[PDB]
Ligand binder design. Structure first.
Ligand SMILES: Nc1ncnc2c1ncn2[C@@H]1O[C@H](COP(=O)(O)OP(=O)(O)O)[C@@H](O)[C@H]1O
Ligand code: BEF
Lengths: 663, 93, 102, 86, 105, 95, 103, 78, 97
DNA sequence: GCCTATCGATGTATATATCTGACACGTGCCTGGAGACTAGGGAGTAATCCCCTTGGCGGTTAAAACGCGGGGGACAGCGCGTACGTGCGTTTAAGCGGTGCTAGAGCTGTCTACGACCAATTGAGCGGCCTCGGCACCGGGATTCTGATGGCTGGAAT
DNA sequence: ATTCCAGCCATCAGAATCCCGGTGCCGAGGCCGCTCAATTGGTCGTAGACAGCTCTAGCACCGCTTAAACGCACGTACGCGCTGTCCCCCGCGTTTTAACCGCCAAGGGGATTACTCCCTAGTCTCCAGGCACGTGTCAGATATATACATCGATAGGC
């Protein structure tokens, strides 16, 4: 059938080069007489050029980008008008915010690590050096004058050269992998640990290090489940350092640290284990390319230069290819309970990573089912636990002897030391549950939700009736605060002092919370608020801004770089921040705060282990004072219903766990 | 439980026309939907023909007329030829 | 010693490239999640507390994209008819009226 | 700071999305008023389809809209869709 | 053989077509030849579509028929385009076509 | 002559109930009869397809209700549904 | 009889017979024909009322296809129901585009 | 015979359509489109007639053919 | 006396839109229908109602096409219909695509 | 105001080498199709007869058909100006991974109501007639355009 | 100081529907009788209505990356108004062709009816197409490759 350009917008005479770090050292401030301007910022040049400049200097050089000044003018006018009307308390909050922000900005000027050096020996003795930025990703790396960097940052060039000349970097072939050496008992802390500062590991840490070493000599991987607050990471880095020195093993190591805890690990690997080079493999694609170019391979030998990496799960997943061939011996994982669901892509990714020793670090590995514990055990040695059905039949529930069998088999693979058995100095935790009655507005919204009479809630609100497809999550919102379901009408009250009263009376919980916070304020105790609803944090922040001192915040939207500063400011001695707003899943895990005496759980997670994790953020090694924990519960509401499940689960878990001790 | 479809028969047709070629699952679903649609269309036209002529039965002739009404030109002619051949071979048994 | 002591395509070149690219590619163009949001919002007006299977939204998106593409083709023909190159709302209106949509 | 404003769901069919759909249709130049018109037309089409889909769902005593409901609704309008059932 | 498709020499299920017609409430009776005829028609239409689909696939250097190939085959044939004129094939896209008035001389 | 059924006697009663002093010619009547037949056929087809889709062997009143809602515009659909419900209620009353 | 019981002027028995001898479903419910008859009667009543209004507007007293066409095309719902339908002797709705009219 | 559809007839049909001015080329196009429409309808009409084993094309055949083509005609039966 | 171009056109528009009669001569249409049918089967007979139905359908189709053509012409800011208008109308309708 | 020529650089395309998930075959079993057989209604005839389609013909207007002039639309070429495209830096939110729950989508199974299929029977609706009014006709009646004579002046021009 | 086009109204011939009365057909709408199809009453057996139960799979977050959206700047291409020329159509008159109507005649095909017998639906027993599920591993998704067509557009040939 071409001229420079402005980057951003932040006495008379002080301008130009003389104000730069080349001359301010010799002449300081050219004038400091009795108008005002803001810090220099140019597109294309490093921040280390900080100076004080005037409106005319840009014009004189004909810098392209003057038209950009209009937005800055808008900002200036808005700030001027807004600040005057701001209440004195809000003014204080804003001033503290500015004070912290300028310090954040300045921190960039401090160079952390020289990355590369140019063959052009300027002045025949000053090669150009590629300088890293403190608190900024590798994407911002720029070359700087060798002499200039030496004047203010001499030591860093010595660091980079010494590391470059070093030969401790790992090698592809190792005889240790073929046959493990004989175990040697560590009777006392080696002198090289802690450095000249003489830092001493606590005894239980030394015992755990001995246990981990013994397990390594047998070739068996292990799970470390030390009770939260005992410093698991210190023991991990101690094992790494032991592998370094007492075995001459400088093999690749890969610690998958969460994002919130990355900086803590980095600081501790710099203080401890200073003999090892660390690479924080975080940032955008370009920054990772920069690392993979400069800090990855020793081009003169094609050998690996790094010792310990610091990656997150989300980044490791998105670059799983590159590491797949560069097999690492010591693939460590922190906050390992993410591996409790073997189907999760992290499990399938890491299980294909050829590793010789994997150590999981999780405070509460027991979790809600034996399957999760089996999953972790499988991650230890896939050969010995390759079958689920066999394990299930071998450990049939109900019979009492099976639990003792479990506690026997776990002992060589899982190590855990309760606080009371290793450090009695720590004050005992105080747990109190404060019932509270729902407010009348809460009761009316609750009645409407239960009847699903959307007609009432819709009055003057954009809420969608289809958003009620999960009544549990809306009942929880109603219980917490009315504003979550129905945004408050800002036109009802123009005076803040009245809107604050309405906000307080709107939520029954706040009626107790404000009084509790004031009473703790009298004692001078700092308070940590953990909540699993991020909008709840917004509500609480708005409430705080009216009355109390500046507060730091930690939720998943806060970029990592700022979390370092927030944590340091709250922890730093002399801090005035009254309380810390921490989202549970983001900030409740791992971070070592140890600077507060109250931990208030606004809303309870479906999983009590997360709540226990949050409580332990304060109750850590650094606490010199007892911590009082208050769990908020709304009487006559589903929140108690959740707590009943929590009680059953907790009783069962405690009964099982207590069998581990020979009491 | 069991859902019945034309997957295997379309696959046989494919391995007759293009032995090497394969067929993705969504392509197979598309072909199944097309077969169902043409089936229902021809059946409906045949039913209308029967009701109009006050018949009570659908015969090969009704299907032939439905094909002539639905498919255009050469497609209809070839479909009619194939149907006549199939019926003849069936009777020849 | 640093011490401190362009190309531009013309209007229409990229449009043709986009035309070719999106005629070649079969990938869905509207972002899935906002389309799901709009589908749910519209459905709310008919029956509250409705649930959507994941394939229902996909089918609706495919049908809507195909309908919009056909409408844009007809609109382009209408614009060319007026000896123009820009599609304007009256072009869509004419296309719909001829197609018989009220 | 954020003023708690939220954009309309209909505005979620962004200007680049209408631009891309126009490109697939062979449109070289697009007037700025097309976007509102396109949004309205799409809303009308969705209303017409979803009405029939919801009716079908209600008939079955179901509270979930299934792909077959959408297929039937489109077939009623003479817009048969393939790849989701039949 | 014991199968009605073998007699007619078709691949499509003649008995399944007979079941569908008999149960579809199209008529009160169904002849013996109507299933055979309809099965043959369906088989021919499937073969006609698949030939073009495979040709399009081989053009793109592929080996599996995807919806794009089916759409290309359907839209590039005048007869199939009329039969499937109001059919939207998911993930099939559209035929490449740029109006002359848009491109420069 | 064999018998051709029609709705003439019914359309005429409806006309004489909405407009007593009005009449209808032989062609308007044919148009009305065709309209009735077409609406019947479309509603019946909707009911049948609804039944087959839902794997059911009966055309219930609810099938006709959904068919009317699918086919007629909103206001016509609502009024037709109301009248059908009233008719069914009255029919069931005399049980 | 089965129509007086429903108060419908249209025939329920004929609708039942057509539903059964129509190849629509294996069996047909008792209530289906009454519903269908009521719907048809309502539609006929609406069309006839509009047609009679149109006839009054023309001073005739006998409905002819012109009247039915006018009624259908002047009602949006009826026009949408019968969009694809052409009525013999119906003519067209008087409609002259403005641009064609003189200044 | 197609010329039997003369210029005045197409003129009148255009008038009923609201056309005020008609170009001289519209007539051939109208004749062609009319021929195509007639062919499409009549083929189906004859097909219906042939199935009935008849020789006279009845009005019902035309009605069925139009209903297939989406041109439902009221006035003769259905 | 002599009307300006356009007045009689609107007069005819009003005359024919108001009326309902068939515009095409019946006998030429009968001949066209018979000729078209001749290609399919010889000796065919047509009922008068069949021819009238075909005429009604053809007139309705042509009138609708002319309305669409008029809309297309106005789109180009013209007032005179020409073939490309019919072609555009058909293509948009899908009849010729 | 034009031809060609190279890169302000740019984006497709056409090559590899992974690796990875979807797809092409295998295997158990349980439903559905296929061999038997039967009953009986519907389809298939051959007759008959009635209509209504086809074809003739003569007169008889209506329409179609040309032919001319001149008005006003079609259509081209020109000229502003603005809104659209392109491109960049910044931001937002989609997308995806992980964690919870549980509403509700499908199934099984029980047994009961309500349709199907009968039989008598009876009245609605059908075809067949029959006889006036609604609506054609068709005037001359009125009157409602409508285009060319018209009065004037403002505005730009004299 | 003076004045002719657009222009507000103008005013008067025609040229049109329309408005009206007559006249008078014929198709409505009413009545009659009688068929057959709908109604009443009965048994009868399975849809399907309801209940109880398992898990998909659908919803609601948080968290985090990062690509796409967003806002703004620049300039140039396209739109839309404008003017002017020309030809193409409209309107009208007069001639020519052919519809249209009425009465008539034929016989061909639709329609109908009696009678027959063959093919289909319904029931039963018995497997082997078919499908769910599992699985091993190539085709395609995906990195990194250069190769190849030009936004122009700049510089020199006239
Ligand atoms: N060996 C040690 N000696 C003294 N202090 C220690 C030691 N190990 C840990 N710490 C304290 O623990 C804090 C770090 O907590 P860390 O154990 O890193 O948290 P994580 O639970 O994430 O491991 C530090 O502030 C430090 O003061
Ligand atoms: F318990 Be640790 F701070 F993770």
């Amino acid at each position: 059938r071409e001229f420079e350009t402005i980057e951003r917008f932040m006495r008379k005479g002080a301008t130009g080069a003389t104000t730069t770090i080349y001359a301010v050292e010799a002449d300081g401030d050219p004038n400091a007489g009795f108008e005002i301007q803001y810090l220099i910022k140019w597109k294309g040049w490093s921040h280390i050029h900080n100076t004080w400049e005037t409106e005319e200097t840009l014009k004189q050089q004909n810098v392209r980008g003057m038209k950009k000044l209009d937005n800055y003018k808008k900002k200036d006018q808005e700030t001027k008008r807004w600040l005057k009307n701001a209440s004195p308390e809000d003014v204080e909050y804003y001033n503290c915010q500015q004070e912290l922000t300028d310090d954040l900005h300045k921190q960039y000027q401090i160079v952390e690590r020289i990355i590369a050096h140019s063959n052009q020996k300027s002045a025949a003795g000053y090669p150009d050096y590629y300088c890293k930025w403190q608190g900024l990703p590798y994407s911002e790396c720029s070359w700087e004058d060798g002499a200039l960097i030496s004047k203010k940052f001499q030591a860093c060039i010595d660091e980079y050269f010494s590391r470059n000349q070093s030969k401790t970097t790992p090698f592809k072939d190792c005889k240790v992998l073929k046959q493990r050496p004989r175990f040697v008992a560590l009777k006392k802390q080696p002198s090289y640990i802690g450095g000249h500062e003489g830092l001493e590991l606590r005894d239980y840490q030394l015992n755990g290090l001995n246990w981990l070493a013994h397990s390594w000599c047998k070739g068996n991987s292990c799970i470390l489940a030390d009770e939260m607050g005992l410093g698991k990471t210190i023991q991990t880095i101690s094992f790494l350092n032991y592998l370094f020195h007492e075995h001459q093993l400088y093999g690749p190591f890969l610690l998958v640290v969460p994002l919130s805890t990355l900086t803590s690990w980095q600081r501790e690997i710099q203080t401890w284990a200073s003999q090892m080079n660390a690479v924080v493999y975080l940032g955008d694609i370009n920054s990772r390319n920069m690392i993979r170019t400069h800090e990855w391979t020793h081009h003169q030998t094609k050998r690996l230069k790094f010792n310990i990496l610091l990656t997150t799960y989300e980044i490791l997943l998105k670059d799983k290819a590159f590491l797949g061939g560069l097999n690492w011996a010591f693939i460590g994982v922190d906050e390992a309970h993410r591996l409790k669901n073997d189907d999760s892509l992290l499990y399938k990714t890491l299980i294909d990573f050829k590793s010789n020793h994997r150590l999981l670090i999780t405070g509460t590995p027991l979790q809600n089912s034996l399957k999760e514990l089996w999953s972790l055990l499988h991650f230890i040695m896939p050969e010995k636990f390759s079958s689920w059905e066999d394990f299930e039949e071998e450990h049939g529930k109900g019979r009492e002897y099976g639990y003792a069998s479990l506690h026997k088999e776990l002992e060589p693979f899982l190590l855990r030391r309760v606080k009371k058995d290793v450090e009695k100095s720590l004050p005992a935790k105080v747990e109190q549950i404060l019932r509270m009655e729902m407010s009348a507005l809460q009761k009316q919204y609750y009645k409407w939700i239960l009847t699903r009479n959307y007609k009432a809630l819709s009055k003057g609100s954009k809420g969608s009736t289809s958003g009620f497809l999960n009544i549990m999550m809306e009942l929880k919102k109603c219980c917490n605060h009315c504003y979550l379901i129905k945004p408050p009408d800002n036109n009802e009250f123009y005076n803040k002092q009245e809107a604050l009263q309405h906000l307080i009376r709107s939520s029954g919980k706040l009626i107790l919370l404000d009084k509790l916070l004031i009473r703790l304020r009298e004692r001078g105790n700092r308070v940590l608020i953990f909540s699993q609803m991020v909008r709840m944090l917004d509500i609480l922040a708005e409430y705080l801004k009216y009355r109390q001192f500046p507060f730091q915040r930690l939720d998943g939207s806060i970029k990592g770089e700022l979390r370092k500063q927030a944590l340091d400011h709250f922890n730093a001695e002399g801090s005035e921040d009254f309380c810390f707003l921490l989202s549970t899943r983001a900030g409740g895990l791992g971070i070592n705060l140890a600077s507060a005496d109250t931990v208030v759980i606004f809303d309870s997670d479906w999983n009590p282990q997360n709540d226990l994790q949050a409580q332990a953020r304060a109750h850590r090694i650094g606490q010199k004072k007892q911590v009082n924990i208050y769990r908020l519960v709304t009487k006559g509401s589903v929140e108690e219903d959740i707590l009943e499940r929590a009680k059953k689960k907790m009783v069962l878990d405690h009964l099982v766990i207590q069998r581990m001790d020979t009491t | 439980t069991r859902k019945e479809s034309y997957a295997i028969y379309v696959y046989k047709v494919l391995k007759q026309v293009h032995p090497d070629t394969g067929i993705s699952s969504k392509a197979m679903s598309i072909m199944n939907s097309f077969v169902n649609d043409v089936f229902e269309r021809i059946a409906g036209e045949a039913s209308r023909l029967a009701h109009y002529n006050k018949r009570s039965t659908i015969t090969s002739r009704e299907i032939q007329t439905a094909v002539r009404l639905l498919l255009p030109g050469e497609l209809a002619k070839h479909a009619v030829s194939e149907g006549t051949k199939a019926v003849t071979k069936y009777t020849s048994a | 010693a640093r011490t401190k002591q362009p190309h531009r395509y013309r209007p229409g070149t990229v449009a043709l490239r986009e035309i070719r690219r999106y005629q070649k590619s079969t990938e869905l163009l509207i972002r899935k999640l906002p389309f799901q949001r709009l589908v749910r919002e519209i459905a709310q007006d008919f029956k509250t507390d409705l649930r959507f299977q994941s394939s229902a939204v996909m089918a609706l998106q495919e049908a809507s994209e195909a309908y919009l593409v056909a409408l844009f083709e007809d609109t382009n023909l209408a614009a060319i008819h007026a000896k123009r190159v820009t599609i304007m709302p009256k072009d869509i209106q004419l296309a719909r009226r001829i197609r018989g949509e009220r | 700071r954020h003023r708690k404003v939220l954009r309309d769901n209909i505005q979620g069919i962004t200007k680049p999305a209408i631009r891309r759909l126009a490109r697939r249709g062979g449109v070289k130049r697009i007037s700025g008023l097309i976007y509102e018109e396109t949004r309205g037309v799409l809303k009308v089409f969705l209303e017409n389809v979803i009405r029939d889909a919801v009716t079908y769902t209600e008939h079955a005593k179901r509270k979930t809209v299934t792909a077959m409901d959408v297929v039937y609704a489109l077939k009623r309008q003479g817009r048969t869709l393939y790849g989701f059932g039949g | 053989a014991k199968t009605r498709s073998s007699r007619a020499g078709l691949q499509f299920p003649v008995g399944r077509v007979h079941r569908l017609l008999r149960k579809g409430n199209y008529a009160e009776r169904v002849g013996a030849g109507a299933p055979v005829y309809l099965a043959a028609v369906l088989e021919y239409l499937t073969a006609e579509i698949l030939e073009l689909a495979g040709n399009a696939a081989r053009d793109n250097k592929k080996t599996r028929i995807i919806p794009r190939h089916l759409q290309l085959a359907v839209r590039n044939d005048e007869e199939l385009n009329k039969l499937l004129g109001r059919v939207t094939i998911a993930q099939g896209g559209v035929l490449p076509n740029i109006q002359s008035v848009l491109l420069p001389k």
